[PDB]
Design a protein around this nucleic acid. Structure first.
Ligand code: K
Ligand code: MG
Ligand code: MG
Ligand code: MG
Ligand code: MG
Ligand code: MG
Ligand code: MG
Ligand code: MG
Ligand code: MG
Ligand code: MG
Lengths: 48, 178, 170, 148
RNA sequence: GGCCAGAACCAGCCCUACUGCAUUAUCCUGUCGGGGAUCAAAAUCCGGCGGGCAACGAAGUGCAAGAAUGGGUCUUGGUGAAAUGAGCGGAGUAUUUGUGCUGCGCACGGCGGCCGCACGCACUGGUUUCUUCUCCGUGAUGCUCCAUGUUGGCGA
RNA sequence: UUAGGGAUAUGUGGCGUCAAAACUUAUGGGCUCAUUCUCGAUACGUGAAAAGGGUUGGUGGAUCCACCGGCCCCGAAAAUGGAUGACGCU
RNA sequence: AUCGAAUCGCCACCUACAAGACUGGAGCUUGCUCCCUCGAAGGCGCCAAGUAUAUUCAUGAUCACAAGACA
């Protein structure tokens, strides 16, 4: 395997022309750790 | 699908020399994927029939013969092929198609399927369109009855590619996964 | 047998490919796999070859002969009035609706969403009134069974006194 | 014409003033608003909504974070002249509900003009409901196939 | 801020869409004959004769040069510390590329000098009916390296 | 055919799962059914002869007979439990 | 009670059954005709409890896990 490129399957996208529409879009992976660490707007918005 | 072979006419001759100032001009019909293969077959036939080699010859013309309008027709194809066990075998077959190129491509596929003969071991002798009353095989003759009709059974209909799915509800068209 | 046979003059509808969802007339049969299709009404339906796996036969058959001329085909179609009859069916209306849905804008999808919601609201209104008269839902069926047993014993002297005291206390 | 000119712009043709847009990010994600103008020097767009319908105030937003639809409202008689970068400028703070009177007055005037324009336009009730509506991605939806 | 992100523009590079010229005849279409089949027809098929462009996005065919000027670059550098630009600046708003039509002489084909020329070469031949922008400009008195934007988050 | 790294595109080989690629592509044509080493999918190479017979083709001759091709079957018997790489595939 | 977390459609109309060489109903002429609900849609849900000129949203200041979740 070559680990610096990832493959993603998206619901309701089943053709190559459909996948072209998403070129350039932003992608996020969400998880959790064990302790609370720094984040964006750590002091401006303590609720985050 | 459109046939994978095209109908070529090749016109050629031997290069003039002191021995033969005015050589004969030959015409040749072939069915080939492209004009390079057509020229190769033309020179092979010239070498094996008239003792003229491609290194001492000229090609005056190499053109495509256009097909006629699409009409359901009966085509008679006289064809031959080689095998090591039996030498050369010649046969005459009847097909139903809409063009001579289609009929010849169908004949090539049929020979490959039923006798394991490849393209370069096959020579086409003749192809023509024949009337209905001259057809001899019943498997072909059955298709020109005046009241031919039949239903479509055991069909496998696949959905449009954009609409295909993996999991679908039982008695419902709702898709569950893709 | 209620299955439409493949024959000369039979109307068909194309399943897949660039000619999807159009209709045409069969003019000749080549073999078990292929037919010739034409339709003078549509501009993209000149005489051509169709594979039989891409065809859905319809219920209308015009009376023509095999390899009929263009003039003969056009006259037969008008006389049969098959296209007019087909256009009034439910499946024909469904096909045109799918084309409309594929080209809709964001504002048009909003208008459809309003219309569906308005229908569902009025359906609940109509259902509720008939439900009160004739009990058919789960809760109204329970009420019908419960009222008869509850009422006969709620008329007890002790129950009335306790109910009066409880209501007065509140 | 000059790239250094304040009038220079490369905004796409769909994001014309008076068009209705869908907000894709930020606090007001999913709401629909009206595009008013673009700030000079190829700056961000300004949207109102207006606030009475969906709660969006006059705000700046980058054009890459909206979807501009083909539904438009004629806002010629709104006079969006006072909206400038000075109103969005903020005073610096050093060594450490609430709305300024000028901002409130500007919001009131712009909102009144926009409401008048929407009501005067045909299909006004439908447009008002459309502006009140909310956009979301449901299961089974394929936005990559839709026409906006 | 020598940290983390978003967007804009510039140079280069990469991948897209937008396409003209030759060719077609074993072909296209009427009419007469025979031929076939039918319930009577037509149709598949074979001769003659008269016209031809199968031209809808004609054709699965032989070449193609269409960016005057759509997106990506956390796959490259930058924010003008030399921008060399059909792109920056200035001045004109007319040149001259092709298409169409056409003159003389030569060339080419046919017949045995005359007849043909699909439009070849020369005269940079004529015409302007369609089509297209055109012309000027910044050395280093810098031998070499480094040093310059915008909007938020974090940092008091 | 090989300095240390990115991007793009290919070679041999592949696109049911293992395993990246037809989420099992086509609006392509034919052929094939295999009951205990359990048809086939084995380039090099890592199984098979003489001789024989279910379907699908081709030459001749009659008014139905010989001939010879494709795929399949018989011929085909060993020593720990096991191998188209495994599951499976019609 | 540590606990802050990843997950983002729900229903008491789907949540019963069987067949793809025969699915609504007849008729003989067996592939055609006639009749019907016309034979390729589980119901809701996407911001006024419902399609009407009703109503608070900012300063959380241009993206950032969605600063919100018993629909
Ligand atoms: K005739
Ligand atoms: Mg701001
Ligand atoms: Mg004739
Ligand atoms: Mg210029
Ligand atoms: Mg895979
Ligand atoms: Mg045999
Ligand atoms: Mg095995
Ligand atoms: Mg095996
Ligand atoms: Mg293997
Ligand atoms: Mg969160």
């Amino acid at each position: 395997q070559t680990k610096q490129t990832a493959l993603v399957r998206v619901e309701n996208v089943n053709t190559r022309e459909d996948a072209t529409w998403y070129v350039g879009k932003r992608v996020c992976y969400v998880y959790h750790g064990k302790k609370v660490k720094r984040c964006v707007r750590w002091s401006k918005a303590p609720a985050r | 699908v459109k046939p994978h072979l095209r109908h070529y006419q090749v016109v050629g001759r031997e290069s003039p020399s002191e021995k033969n100032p005015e050589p004969t001009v030959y015409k040749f019909e072939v069915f080939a994927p492209n004009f390079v293969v057509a020229k190769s077959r033309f020179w092979r036939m010239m070498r094996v029939k008239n003792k003229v080699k491609a290194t001492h010859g000229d090609v005056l013309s190499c053109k495509v013969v256009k097909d006629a309008k699409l009409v359901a027709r009966n085509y008679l194809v006289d064809i031959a092929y080689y095998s090591q066990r039996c030498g050369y075998t010649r046969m005459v077959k009847e097909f139903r198609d809409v063009s001579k190129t289609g009929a010849v491509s169908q004949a090539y596929h049929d020979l490959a399927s039923r006798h394991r003969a490849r393209y370069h071991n096959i020579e086409v002798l003749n192809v023509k369109s024949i009337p209905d009353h001259e057809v001899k095989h019943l498997s072909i003759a059955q298709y020109h009855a005046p009241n031919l009709s039949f239903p479509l059974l055991q069909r496998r209909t696949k959905a449009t590619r954009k609409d295909r799915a993996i999991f679908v509800k039982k008695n419902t068209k709702r898709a569950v996964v893709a | 047998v209620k299955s439409h046979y493949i024959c000369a003059g039979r109307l068909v509808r194309i399943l897949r490919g660039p000619r999807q969802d159009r209709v045409g007339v069969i003019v000749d049969i080549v073999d078990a796999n292929r037919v010739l299709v034409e339709n003078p009404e549509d501009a993209k339906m000149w005489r051509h070859v169709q594979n039989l796996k891409n065809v859905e036969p319809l219920k209308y058959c015009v009376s023509v002969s095999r390899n009929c001329s263009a003039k003969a085909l056009k006259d037969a179609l008008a006389s049969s009035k098959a296209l007019e009859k087909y256009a009034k069916t439910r499946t024909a209306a469904r096909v045109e609706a799918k084309k409309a849905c594929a080209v809709s804008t964001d504002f048009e999808r909003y208008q459809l969403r309003v219309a569906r919601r308005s229908r569902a609201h009025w359906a609940r209104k109509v259902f509720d009134e008939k439900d009160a008269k004739t009990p058919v839902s789960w809760h109204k069926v329970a009420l019908k069974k419960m009222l008869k047993k509850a009422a006969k014993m709620d008329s007890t002297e002790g129950a009335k006194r306790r109910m009066q005291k409880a209501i007065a206390a509140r | 014409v000059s790239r250094k000119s304040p009038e220079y712009t490369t905004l796409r043709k769909s994001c014309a003033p008076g068009a209705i847009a869908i907000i894709l990010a930020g606090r007001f994600r999913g709401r629909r608003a009206v595009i008013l103008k673009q700030l000079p020097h190829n700056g961000p767009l300004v949207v109102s909504g207006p606030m009475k319908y969906n709660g969006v105030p006059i705000r700046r937003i980058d054009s890459r974070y909206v979807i501009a639809t083909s539904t438009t409202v004629d806002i010629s008689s709104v006079d969006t002249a006072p909206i400038t970068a000075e109103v969005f400028q903020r005073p610096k703070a050093e060594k450490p509900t609430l709305v300024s009177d000028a901002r409130a007055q500007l919001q009131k005037k712009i909102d009144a003009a926009l409401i008048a324009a929407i009501k005067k336009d045909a299909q006004g009730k439908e447009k008002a409901g459309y502006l009140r509506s909310v956009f979301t991605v449901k299961p089974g939806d394929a936005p990559h196939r839709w026409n906006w």
